[model samples]
Target: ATYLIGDVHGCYDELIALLHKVEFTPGKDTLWLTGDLVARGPGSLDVLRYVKSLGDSVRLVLGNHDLHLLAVFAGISRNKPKDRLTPLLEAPDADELLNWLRRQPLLQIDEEKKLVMAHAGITPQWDLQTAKECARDVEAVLSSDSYPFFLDAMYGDMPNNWSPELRGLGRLRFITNAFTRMRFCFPNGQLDMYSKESPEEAPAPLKPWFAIPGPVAEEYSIAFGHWASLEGKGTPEGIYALDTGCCWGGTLTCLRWEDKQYFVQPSNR
Candidate 1:
């Protein structure tokens, strides 16, 4: 059996409870985390350590905050007080933990299940195959010698439209943003990285990324977090928004992939 859980965001106690509720047998059942495993909640250290300890039982794609942690560790970005990440940064094995983190991919493709998982939802413009290749490109850069350089250039929201013509770090930035920060997209298929509103409240001409139709949804299911305001629902069929805002006073949500059964635990706060 397989399970897909939304952003942990350092909410360790609720994660434990959710696992218990599912009767998760880690060695036998696989768990897929929709990234953003840390930041904005208590116990990031606990969440990272416990998840890593599970060895072959888990797979996690990188999220925006997760990438921010890597940049902060590299001294290229500042850690903000609101993120509550200083203690994790100061941990004894922080290097080892982030080493594992940096190697994580920006996308997860479960061939057997025919599902595409990203920290943020996949963009509406590209086919699933294009998304997978772009994911590999970023994964290559993140694990290479130029990782720090890549991280330094990974920010910004330029060239929002995806083009085979888009080049250099701008291309990578678009890929990373599409994978982790995307929410609303313009009708012309360009991304809107700054706007964070959910569909109904989003200003005119802006719509949730999932609402913009394309070939990816036609081929496979999509799983994502990052939009906690969705509260674990509000997508069309075959697309799942799992982040229930556990760090923001909502429940932690989990989906049992096999039967499509859902399990949730209220935030322990």
Candidate 2:
């Protein structure tokens, strides 16, 4: 069976414990991660190495923290204190790790199950095919030698509206933000990339992107991380919010892809 896991955030011990609890068998079972696999905890290096070593058993989408790590490695962003990304950069296999990470996609889908996974959330405006198309657009740029150039211009809040007419860095940045950094959106479906509050606490007109009534959620199942404040629950129909905040003294969560059952291991720290 395949398990869909939430944000790992460098909680290596918790991940191991949770895997053991779930009886994860490397070759036999699979892990589909909602991203944010590193940063904010003491074990970024170990976590990245372990995940990379998993080979085909694991599938992951990129998260905001994960992007920051890549940007720092590419000299587009500086390391911030408390993020604890330095250890990862200083590791012997840093180059290998970075290369592997940059190749990961921002969006992933299980077509048969009609399930999608992203670090943050998908915009209501995008259908499944549109989402895939947009994801590939960014994925192409990210996998190319010019990836660092794109990352250098990746940080910003402009072009808040999604437009097919957008090109170059603007198009890629919006796609990246929607898949990895989005949480809330304006009533008209414009992404509100900055709000970091739970549903009830978010100010008026700023609703969770998935909560917006639309075809994306009705026709497909989406599982995502990024917003830890959800506490692993309270998602609207057909949407799953899985970030249980393990790195912040919460639990590591997993959703069985076959049965849609949840398994959680409280933080070891």
Candidate 3:
């Protein structure tokens, strides 16, 4: 059996309870992580260490916090006080752990299973085909020798609108925002970088990215985290919300993709 687990956000203890609670046997039961494995809660270092120890039993995508950690690793961005990654940064094997994170993809797809997932929701504007290409482009840069340059370019929110014609940093920024930072779309397929509203609470004209009609969720079952405000609710069929605010005193959710049965482990944070 395969379980799709939500963001750990450094809530390692809750993750352990959820795994034991679900009777997960690592290699035997494979877990697909929704990412954001570090930051915001206790045990960021331990979380990375434990996951790395699991080896091939896990598959994951890169969430925003994960990217921020990479930037901090690159020495190109300030470690935000709120993220609390000091211990992780100072870990003896920190470089190896950061490299492991950099190697993770922006998307994870199980072709035969018709499943596709990412850290945040896939943008409504692109076809799944286009999204895949965009992910690969970013992946290459992040995992490449020149990753620092791209990481430095990652800070801006400019060119909020997407256009294939947009080049260089504009294109990269748009693609990066679409995969890891986005939550809402303001009518014209433009990313609402600031809004954190759940669909029910979002003012009209601005809709949850998945709510907009698109070719994104048509073919594969989509899974994502990054929007804990949704509290693991309100998505249509073939779409899964993985984050349930585990780092914010909420439950950590683990969903069985095969049967749609979900298990929750309340946070100790």
Candidate 4:
């Protein structure tokens, strides 16, 4: 009775088309997104506004771009001069948009349905509650006026492994890596953060997040997005890769969690 969606990445028109195909009625249905709802497209502002208008019917987690937008809006970070999100960042309701986005959870779950929705994959090292706590630390900073200080912690690859002992921005960076911009990492659970491609061509130090194993909590069907370089391709029955590369001339995909069905809309490019 729920639907999990991949990265929106500002493709409002395509999203609308896919929703029409599914006959999505918010009151009777639920839509969970893997994040990255803005940037890299023509309609970032429109997309955020529409989702906000949905009230409580829509569930969103944070993605790399989503966080970056928040950072910029918080005045703690600067976006690339050529980044196409200026239109969105400058929207009249930008403050409202940023406030809502910062409050979004990094992960969500419905224990009854055994459905876990995260922007990035969860590792065996941490359980769902632990992840929530870590995410809250970053969220707390972003939601506060001192968020830019945390944004300063947003770079680099050290303190990469998960550890409660990790402190300050090191902890923030660790949580951020796991929540966004992570794909392949070393056996030690450290990130190879710079690489951006599929597993077949990953660096020696890199291994897909899910490939690392012990036993992750909340083991159920997971819905996520962000690895569009895969072009909407990834595997394993319990995990779903929804980033269909809409920003890169690839299609956009939506999974109907209600009936466990999905829909794909071709890219205009």
Of the candidates shown, which would achieve the greatest lDDT relative to the real structure?
Answer: 1
Candidate 2 residue lDDT tens string, 108-208: 88779888888987898787788889988888878889888888888888677887788877887788888988888999888886778888899998988
Q: What does candidate 3's lDDT look like per residue over 75-94, in tens digits?
A: 99999989989999998999
The sequence of per-residue lDDT tens digits that candidate 4 reaches over residues 184-256 is 7788766667788888888786777777762543367667788877665666667778888887778889887
Candidates' lDDT values, in order? 0.89, 0.87, 0.89, 0.78
In TM-score terms, candidate 2 sits at 0.97
RMSD of each: 1.0, 1.1, 1.2, 1.7
Error of 1 at 59 (Å): 1.4
Reference-based lDDT, residue 3, model 3: 90
| Model 1 stretches with alpha carbons more than 4 Å out | none
Q: Order the candidates by TM-score, highest first.
A: 1, 2, 3, 4
Error of 3 at 177 (Å): 0.5
Ranking by lDDT: 1, 3, 2, 4
In model 2, pairs of residues that clash are none
